[PDB]
Design a protein around this ligand. Sequence first.
Ligand SMILES: Fc1ccc(-c2n[nH]cc2-c2ccc(NCCN3CCNCC3)c(C(F)(F)F)c2)cc1
Ligand SMILES: [Mg+2]
Lengths: 69, 502, 103, 1340
Amino acid sequence: GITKASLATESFISAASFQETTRVLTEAAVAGKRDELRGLKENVIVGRLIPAGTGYAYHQDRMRRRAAG
Amino acid sequence: VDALLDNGRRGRAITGSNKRPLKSLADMIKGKQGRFRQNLLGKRVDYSGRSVITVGPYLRLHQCGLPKKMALELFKPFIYGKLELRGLATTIKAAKKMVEREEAVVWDILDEVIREHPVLLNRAPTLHRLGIQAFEPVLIEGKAIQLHPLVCAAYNADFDGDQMAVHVPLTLEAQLEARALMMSTNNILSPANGEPIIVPSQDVVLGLYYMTRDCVNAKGEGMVLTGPKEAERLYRSGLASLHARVKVRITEYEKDANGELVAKTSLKDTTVGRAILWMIVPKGLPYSIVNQALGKKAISKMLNTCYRILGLKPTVIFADQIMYTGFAYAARSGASVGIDDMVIPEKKHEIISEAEAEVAEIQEQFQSGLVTAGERYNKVIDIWAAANDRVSKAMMDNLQTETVINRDGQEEKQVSFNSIYMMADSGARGSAAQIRQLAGMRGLMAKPDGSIIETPITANFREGLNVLQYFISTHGARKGLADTALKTANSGYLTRRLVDVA
Amino acid sequence: PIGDDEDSHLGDFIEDTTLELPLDSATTESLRAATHDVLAGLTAREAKVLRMRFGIDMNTDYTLEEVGKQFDVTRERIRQIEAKALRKLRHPSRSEVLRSFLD
Amino acid sequence: YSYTEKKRIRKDFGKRPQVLDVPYLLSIQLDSFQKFIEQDPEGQYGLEAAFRSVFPIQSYSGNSELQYVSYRLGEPVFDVQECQIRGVTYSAPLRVKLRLVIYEREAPEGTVKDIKEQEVYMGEIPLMTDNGTFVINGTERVIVSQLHRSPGVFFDSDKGKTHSSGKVLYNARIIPYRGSWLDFEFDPKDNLFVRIDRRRKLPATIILRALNYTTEQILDLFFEKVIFEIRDNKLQMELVPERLRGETASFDIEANGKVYVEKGRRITARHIRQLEKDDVKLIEVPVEYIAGKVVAKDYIDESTGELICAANMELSLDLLAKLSQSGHKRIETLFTNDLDHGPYISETLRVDPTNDRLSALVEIYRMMRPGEPPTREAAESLFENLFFSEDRYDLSAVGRMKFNRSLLREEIEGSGILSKDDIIDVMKKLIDIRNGKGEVDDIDHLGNRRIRSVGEMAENQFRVGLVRVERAVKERLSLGDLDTLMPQDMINAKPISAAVKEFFGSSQLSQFMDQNNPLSEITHKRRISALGPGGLTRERAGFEVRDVHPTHYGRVCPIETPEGPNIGLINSLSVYAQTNEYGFLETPYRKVTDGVVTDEIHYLSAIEEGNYVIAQANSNLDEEGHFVEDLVTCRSKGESSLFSRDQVDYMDVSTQQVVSVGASLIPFLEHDDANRALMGANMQRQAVPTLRADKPLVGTGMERAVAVDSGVTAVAKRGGVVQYVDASRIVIKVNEDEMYPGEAGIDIYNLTKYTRSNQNTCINQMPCVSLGEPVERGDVLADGPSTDLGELALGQNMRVAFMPWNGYNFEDSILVSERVVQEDRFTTIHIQELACVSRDTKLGPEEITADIPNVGEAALSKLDESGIVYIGAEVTGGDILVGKVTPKGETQLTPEEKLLRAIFGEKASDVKDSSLRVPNGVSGTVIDVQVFTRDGVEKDKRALEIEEMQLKQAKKDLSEELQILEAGLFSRIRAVLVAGGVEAEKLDKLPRDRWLELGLTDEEKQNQLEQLAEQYDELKHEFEKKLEAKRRKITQGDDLAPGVLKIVKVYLAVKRRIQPGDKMAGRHGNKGVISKINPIEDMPYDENGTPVDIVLNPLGVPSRMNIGQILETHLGMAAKGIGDKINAMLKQQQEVAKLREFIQRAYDLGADVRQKVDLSTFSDEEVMRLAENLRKGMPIATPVFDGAKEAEIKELLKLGDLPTSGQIRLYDGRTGEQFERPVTVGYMYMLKLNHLVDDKMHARSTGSYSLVTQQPLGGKAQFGGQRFGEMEVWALEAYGAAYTLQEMLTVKSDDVNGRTKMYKNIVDGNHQMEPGMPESFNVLLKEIRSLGINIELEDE
Ligand SMILES: Fc1ccc(-c2n[nH]cc2-c2ccc(NCCN3CCNCC3)c(C(F)(F)F)c2)cc1
Ligand SMILES: [Mg+2]
């Protein structure tokens, strides 16, 4: 279901937004989860360019620089 | 320590001398209003403003009226910089002193910084992306924001005192984003479906509808004209009536060659109004589109076809001209509403009486026991419903076709020119249901339980409603407001779940 | 909590008075350019003496005796030059740019 | 007829005569508080009752008792006006007599010493004005009446939603006025449960044990007895012949040598009748039938003394044998039926964990206060203190009443605490409901809904104060020495005073009176709320309670309720409505005895009204008033239908009684859809007063009542002639019959002049009477704001045309002629109160001095030497009202600034400019200034000028009082002396002061002369003391907050006319926002060449169905017609005959209306004035549902010379050519709501910023920016605009670096951003790291 599928998000910063914050932060902290951003909500929170639209030229150029030489 | 980190999982300690429990670090992180982290519920923003909104029909669709003082305060830093760049102000301090004094020279500088600089306009219930649209600012004396009429549909903005907020795009990238993306002219079509959201709303469509329509006999009936020019000239001089059946020569175009516009001319059977209106329609569109009665749907499909043929710009300026002419001619038309514009069926009371006979029939049967109580209930409810249907389909015939008018003979009858009918028919405003509530009887109400009352409202709004009838209508009203105001919230929640999942 | 029961709470309305307004910050940035150009006006030595007597583009500021020991021409001397320096920037050609700053 | 009615008469359509006329609309507010503060020599609600409740307070066993004697309310310190100017509360000191008695130790009770402490002061309780308002801080306030579930017992269902097996459930709830809630509820297993408050569920019987009932008595209580006899041998049974109903034979049913029923045959009415007539008392049964029967009492072996079977246990074939051989003849069993009499309580016992009283009490005490070890005295004390203590529990009178009534009892009054009988009877009724006899009530019914008011709530809060003082008194009486302390040292003030102060100052029900408007006031004062204390919340209760009930009829207005988050959680009080004796809602009715409708009025509550069949307000009766048809529309129980001619018991009093005062002011309401009517009556309260109060052209006939009842006007106390009329005051000379013998008299009215309303509008009274005019008692002496000649004018009527005009009317938009803005009619006067506070900073005190660093002579010009602006000086934005300077020393400047100072030799002051200046953009004139000074600090020059001025004005006013008064008295002495000793020219010669010596012949007239002597002297000295008091009140330093040395309040009067962006609306729910202000040149006009004021949009009319606004237009037009005619006939100056004729003709109008009319009125002087007032237009009244009909309107249009269509030819003022088609033109009454655009407008570039998180915040009332939310962000996300978003949430707002680095680039002509990280996320990082969580930023 849509409300159920929304539960799973790689980025924990994103999840801490719309879900129950207290649980998400703990549950992420124990796993040592590393949030790479990569999404809209997270980049909105952290306050940088959205990985879409005009910013899609930025995040892409940076995405390929990552996991590479 | 627990109380410090997250309070409330043990004892909920209270702050000194104050009963209300003290906010812990967990509560600092969580925030309130459900889940909102200050990037969510919202964030206050500089270079912004807002106010009550007005019409501004003079505007092209790409612009909006922006109050003077508002523009001054909003663009204040730009103004400071533009003032001392031209050297009118020694230093930034002096610039402040100048704009604070509102010296005569600053207004021109403001006209300089305003020109190619777009502004973002937003309304309260933002749902779809069209909730925010970029406009070219036009300096206006007043405290009210002027917003182009064709955009009113996108904002769902009434004129009853709704407010709009302005945001100044600051960085170059923001200006160019606003102009190439959020710009009004760049969104003519709903992202949900390819149909135009720029569709003419109410007054304009009553204008184009009144324009192209035909009565039976009118000034200039049957004559012939060289082209739309002398048609309009025939009209404005009072010689020919706006609506009359007339043959006129027109030149239409078809791009149906390869990327190329073919020309063809002919004598079309049309009216004076349609001929006049044709002057506006650009290029490759066939005369077929303006030769109809021009309802809201047709007036929309005109725009749509124009866009799917000629491209963007012609469609933009087309819509603009359509708005201007719709308003102007609707104004000329002298459309109004009186108490006598709403026509009740003469046969109404008789329908009421017969349908009232049926209930005493079934009542007599329940008295004699031929039928059960519930079966009776269904029977009476059915006869009253049938009654309402009959009165509605009476007043609809009488309202719609009753114009009975003579051309060279004794009698002929056509679709009515009555105001309220034209309004309901064009799609401008009103509908068969509401008009039905005006002339014909209104409905059968239902208790909050949902058990529908077997004594319907016999009276209408043109007549009076008495005490009981009104009291019974009141529940329907209150439940209406409640349900709608609730479905707003449900809508929001739903969209929220949606963007969360996407 | 203050009215509406909403997220408006007392601490939300406490404004930072310790922040300097950008409207002034721009003028602090401009004053430097102005006094720099005007300090390009005086003789290279008078300019050095005035930039020294005050903290202009330098650490701290300097006692007039200090200015004297630096310049090798010492004491009352400096105090004279400074005065005339002020005098050169006193009457407007020089003065029209700086006078606009005092409000 | 009255005297101001001779000035103007409103033409009234409508048929139905008014059997009852509208009462005082403020009745509720005043009556409540009248009950609260008052002396009632008994337990009826008041300060007396709340005193008698907690008192007498006795110590713990120590026999030191504090008893309450009597109380009093001192005279108010400052009166209403003074309290309003200064800003203190209008209140009275409460002085209460307390008697401290000490009982001799080891009594027979007698007192060592009883010290009666004379009236110890506790708290100052606020006072209600004559208008039903309270002044808390210099501000009028209203306490909204409350609507809550009445105290008593209640039975509900909760069918459906629970468990989805259906079966419903049945619950009872005992809700007292004060004390814990008592709840009973069933479950799907039909086990009865009980819970105290919302707490843990316990098996029902567990409470009964705590009342000391053994199992045997519980069974004996809830079930009947089935008798079993072992006689001879083997099993007989006693048979009540009704017991076999709803059951089938389990065996051969036979007795009396005759077999009545055989096995396998269900026992019907026939068998039962056979058994009844043959009278079978005893039958023989098998030993196996008791296999399921449940034994009633305990059974033991007489010999072995051992328990054979415990009470409430299922018998078996063997158990029977075991108790039979012990010699038991009889066995008692429960009478159990799964249809008629249910076996609930038994199973309830089967789930009961306890046995004996003490055990149950243990489980209860461990329920209420869990986890802590239970004690015997603890359980006993708690349980006795819950529902059984006079202290902790009361249902009071309404509670006990509704309780006993709902239990079908006799007594209408009883104890305020529950009894074993009570609880038991409640359980009984619930079990009866589950059994099928009896019905569940509903919460929405107004019989279960009770109205409180100001008095009751204030009583409750004061009660809390008294209990918190009780704890203190008992605390102190503990260790007390004997004769040293008295009833002062214990009892405090602050607790009580703050107990009341907290209530009136901040409460959801206590609010600032909404006064922009006479309708707004009076409609606020009549209001109900289900919110606040004792009520529900918007988030809690759903649609049902909000929805309009049939019981709302005549009590609560269906159509007036707010449109927002709380709908129907407020409503309003109906016109004729009243608070019931018990506190319910009752509405007037007309008694129908036999076949006649009697004019005797009857008041029926919600429950009283229930069974009676009530007729209709609109119905046809004639002559003797018998119903004309053979059946008429009526409503009996909860619904409405056609009812037989003589069935009906009663009839509606008026046609209006269904609605409220707001709805009753909407003309042709019957023609408007309920939504738009709602919106209409909702907006009509938002109308700001105009500069010239006009009058509604299209009325109702209620507006007069609203105008008078609301205190905005000035009403004559006593009838007489006007001696003096000033814009300041009005002096009336009283008639003798209404006049009291002593103190002669004249009634002097001091009118309110220009002053600040609560909404920052202007409130100013104007005299409606002239010099030497007859005035009847109860007549309007002066008009308030938005009231004309004794009627209510909330706005102005104007010429309006329905037609699209160049799209400038586009949605709801309004297009208004320049003629309107020029005539200054829709102009409004706003009155703002600005303040300047002189404080104390550690750097030094702040000066109000006129010496201000860095201001030109133009800036310091408008201020006097002392630093305050002159009264009357017109100001604008930036002007300095009050010069204020605060010390800040040692600026600590920088090098370049030091150079600048070195060149320009300026001494940078140690003082900073804090001066109060007019807020940006607003402009007006100064009508007053006040200076509050800490008591003991030296008053500056200005404040002294003002003080002397006020002193002189005071002396002048008081002297005026005494002079007009004295002359008024001596004028009476002159007249009395002339009877019995008349000397005409002789008496007036000698000095008047020497008149009192002259006597009269023996008679009562000498004693009258005596009276006037006494009262004369009284006035003479009263003047003295009044002047003294006034002087002291002026000179005394007003008490101020901490740190504030002095305060200067400037009062500005701004005049704003009208501009595009303002909100305007009719009474019909038709809004609009003025779009353009159009020249008279371009305005649509008729053949007569008269332009139309406003051009509306016809398209607005069909969709939202309000047809009334059209009717209102039409009739409106017609009204003006009658005016214009007259306006010509006066301008023709014809004569009295012609005018009289035409006006009479107008006031008659075809047939069958109730208005009556003239030529009982003076043919010349009175008539010509009537026409003189009528010439503006002829005011018409349209009663709510009794209103005018189309034919009447057209008929009045004929008399007008104007067409039936209501539409005429119009020409475009631009082209001059005619508009095709006719268009509707008429007169529509229109209101200017105050949404006005120069309020709503806001803009911000770079403002102040919040400290905790750096975000844009207005600190100057220089506004914080707009809030960019989640949805707006999404809207930015759909577009490809990243940079717009980034700058939106980074540089433009949250970035402390970004914003400045931005601004500099903006002024430098470089558009870019160097964003950095938002401060919200930056803080959040710390907040996360402040815990045991490590959150880091990786890589590069
Ligand atoms: F004043 C009037 C006028 C007309 C009617 C009327 N005439 N015919 C049918 C109705 C009718 C029936 C029911 C309701 N509402 C629910 C009340 N029920 C009783 C117990 N509580 C819940 C259910 C209503 C109303 F007013 F609420 F809408 C009207 C009733 C009162
Ligand atoms: Mg709206």
